[PDB]
Amino acid sequence: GSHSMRYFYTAMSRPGRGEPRFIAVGYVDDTQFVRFDSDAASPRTEPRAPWIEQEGPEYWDRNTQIFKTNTQTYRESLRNLRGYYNQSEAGSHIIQRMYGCDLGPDGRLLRGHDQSAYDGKDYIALNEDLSSWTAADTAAQITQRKWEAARVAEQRRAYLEGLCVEWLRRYLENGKETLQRADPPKTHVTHHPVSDHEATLRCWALGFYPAEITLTWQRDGEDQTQDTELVETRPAGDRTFQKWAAVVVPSGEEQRYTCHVQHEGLPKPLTLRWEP
Template identity: 55%
Template sequence: MNRYVSSLFLLATLALPETWAGSHSLKYFSAAVSWPELAEPRFFAVGYVDDLQFARFDSDSESQREEPRAPWMDQVDQVDPDYWDRNTRFHKAAAQSFRIRLQTLRSSYNQSEGGVHTFQHLCGCEVSPELTFKRGFYQFAYDGHDYLALDTETYTWTASVPQALNSKLELEADSSISKERKAYLEETCVQWVKKYLEIGKESLKRTDPPSVQVTHHTAPNGEVILRCRAQDFYPADISLTWLRDGEEQLQDTEFIETRPAGDGTFQKWASVGVTSGQEGKYACRVQHEGLPEPLTLKWEPQSSSTWYIVGGIAVLTIGVIAGFVIWRETSGGNRGHRIQPPV
């Protein structure tokens, strides 16, 4: 259970004097988790900027406060002296609201008091390389399934299940709620992306090229699989493409999503099924901001464990990648809908 909930995250504003390469994002993941051994549901909130964790709140922590999770966040109070106190107040209020919603949702779904249940929330924004608003997200889930979401094109609410219809109607009956969310996503969130990028520019502006390895596997059914794995790279945007005689093999390729490695870098792999004896026809093409040009690699039988390293020594990290299945909102009245996201 701790592994499941250990990855949840946070949000928050200034124009930078330069243009940053690539798009940027600010996301908060929050969750209340109940299970029989707990006296009351445990609440987590975690903030990410460009997919790197920078702050965290845990209702079971000794400090009972939001805490920094990136070295550069020690400077945030120079920009906003009330930052930690304000966000701590928000998270404590959200924890209480989420606990009430868990009770309401168990009733709506006719569930007993026992068992494990989660109420989850994702909010945040993405900005362009010029640091202008690109898109926003404000979503809720119950027990890992979509529940309620704000349509950021029309700023109306979408109920994913019948149990969310009452909340949808209540939210849409008060147009000021959608207007507040719109202002937060399009203005406040974008402003805080700029602030975080400025405060943490030494870490967030860097580029780390990937280390890449191509390996050979045989499935239980005898199928031959080639896997192209990239790791140690930052930022997270990367392209792995399998080619057969120079032609892309998109339909036959299996991908995993880019994942944080737990050390400020990312990992990703792509595999393709091939006919035994035809491995030499296949090559993996890797494109990343940290590479001076695309990297093309083939499987070499005599060196199948070799890592192709660009710009440093690769270390194979076997990290616990905490899953945050998530998003969407809740039934049970407006209580909690009015809480503004943290900055």
């Protein structure tokens, strides 16, 4: 199927409590595979998935050098943005970066990504052309004009179309037994009386990978979007995910309700009912 690689960087200032912390994590699809934390006793890039362990010392050392340099760069960035927004040195602020590459089912590049945010709001993004920028405000325009002068977009394009895809394809092969295995949800419906005339129907999906899933309720074949409580998809801790959707129904009308499940791991969408 389709696959992606992403790095997620968080840099957070903390006046009075030392220099800004830098954390980086890397994912292939919904599987984390590395981490780096500048607050670690001995900061170094660490494996977080079994299939990355086979990478040699040069891989780990080169990663660590990159992240240690980044730690310093983001400290410069935090200082710069503080100034661009005329902010006090007293406050704590966060820069985040997200970047990586998406492949289609045939392993070809679909598109690249490279976005940044300040205090949780979009700041600057590389456009899909991998050539031009979108700046959120006049502060980010300062960054834009700078990055334009230094031809940053060209460097990011070269990475996203080159190393990004090459390393992703490699990880996909080395981790093929898990990364290219979809685990379908285990599904069931539970029934919980609320009162004499109403009951909750809850449609469960458990043990699935990847996280993407569609879980809905219909009444007489019509979607119940407004009346469905749908919890965020949540990690089980064993690589898999969980989700449920619930409706409150009139007692006796349970068989008018059907829960519909779509997941890449399923040949065809599933239809479930409460089974007393």
